[PDB]
Amino acid sequence: QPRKKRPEDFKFGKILGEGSFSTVVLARELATSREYAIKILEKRHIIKENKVPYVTRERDVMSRLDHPFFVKLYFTFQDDEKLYFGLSYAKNGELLKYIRKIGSFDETCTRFYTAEIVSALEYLHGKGIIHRDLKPENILLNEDMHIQITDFGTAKVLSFVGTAQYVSPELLTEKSACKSSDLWALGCIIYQLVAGLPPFRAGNEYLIFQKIIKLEYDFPEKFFPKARDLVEKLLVLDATKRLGCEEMEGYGPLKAHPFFESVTWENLHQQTPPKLT
Numbered sequence: 001q002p003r004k005k006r007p008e009d010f011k012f013g014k015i016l017g018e019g020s021f022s023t024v025v026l027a028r029e030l031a032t033s034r035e036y037a038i039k040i041l042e043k044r045h046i047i048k049e050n051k052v053p054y055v056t057r058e059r060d061v062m063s064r065l066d067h068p069f070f071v072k073l074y075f076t077f078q079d080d081e082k083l084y085f086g087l088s089y090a091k092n093g094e095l096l097k098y099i100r101k102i103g104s105f106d107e108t109c110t111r112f113y114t115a116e117i118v119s120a121l122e123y124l125h126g127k128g129i130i131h132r133d134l135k136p137e138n139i140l141l142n143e144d145m146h147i148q149i150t151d152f153g154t155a156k157v158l159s160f161v162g163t164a165q166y167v168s169p170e171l172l173t174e175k176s177a178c179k180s181s182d183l184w185a186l187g188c189i190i191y192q193l194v195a196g197l198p199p200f201r202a203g204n205e206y207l208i209f210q211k212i213i214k215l216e217y218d219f220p221e222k223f224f225p226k227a228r229d230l231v232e233k234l235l236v237l238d239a240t241k242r243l244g245c246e247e248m249e250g251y252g253p254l255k256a257h258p259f260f261e262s263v264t265w266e267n268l269h270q271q272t273p274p275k276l277t
């Protein structure tokens with residue numbers, strides 16, 4: 001394999017963002033001029049907060065993925081103090097940014113991006129991997145405005161509860177995650193694209209969780225009817241009754257939903273995304 005890379009091989013630039021246990025920094029490789037998003041973690045901190053399993057899982061899961069709709073892990077290295085993961089730089093940033101900018105997506109854009117997310121989940125679930133924290137913050141956009149899903153340290157390969165707005169009722173009642181937990185999140189995301197806001201909203205996490213377990217949400221007027229029907233088939237309390245799950249016979253029936261009638265599923269990454277407003 002190519003020589004193990006080192007910090008001195010790069011010109012580090014701006015911080016892209018900061019998390020509780022990592023910082024992602026844009027960096028240009030001197031030998032190639034390539035730009036990578038480098039995620040940097042301090043070994044001592046990860047060890048003190050008992051996060052070794054999550055960092056290990058992040059590397060291991062991303063190393064297994066080989067599909068256009070995921071961020072790529074190109075390389076890893078470490079110095080005495082830090083771990084460095086070299087990732088795709090998804091130049092257009094978070095899907096959440098576009099939701100906030102545009103407001104609500106039109107039906108064409110909703111369909112196209114939902115289709116890419118579904119296709120990505122089909123790939124992931126096919127590998128027996130559950131994301132467990134699917135949300136617009138973690139669905140990035142490349143330079144060509146195709147999706148690139150990230151954030152795999154908290155994945156489950158067939159304890160953790162993800163972002164409250166997207167939490168499935170089973171994680172609150174049974175303390176257990178399955179592939180269908182990601183399908184509930186998909187439902188929330190479709191709703192969010194169409195309505196501009198996610199379906200379960202309240203002033204704190206407790207109040208959100210109470211809404212989720214009671215299925216307490218409503219659709220806005222003019223919500224595209226076939227998208228409403230799809231969301232109703234994903235936001236189902238019983239995880240074995242969600243469209244897409246193995247007990248509902250998998251991704252075929254989901255991709256066959258009438259909302260997706262005009263979608264060509266075989267080659268979405270080669271299609272030109274519709275312009276967002």
Ligand SMILES: CN(C)C[C@@H]1CCn2cc(c3ccccc32)C2=C(C(=O)NC2=O)c2cn(c3ccccc23)CCO1
Nearest residue numbers: 016017018019024037071087088089090093137150151
């Ligand atoms: C915790 N926080 C850092 C996660 C949050 C949004 C989530 N996030 C983006 C992110 C990662 C990597 C590992 C976990 C979570 C990530 C990535 C990138 C990137 O280019 N490739 C990535 O995989 C970016 C991170 N950021 C970007 C801003 C604008 C463009 C691209 C960004 C900062 C926002 O990151």
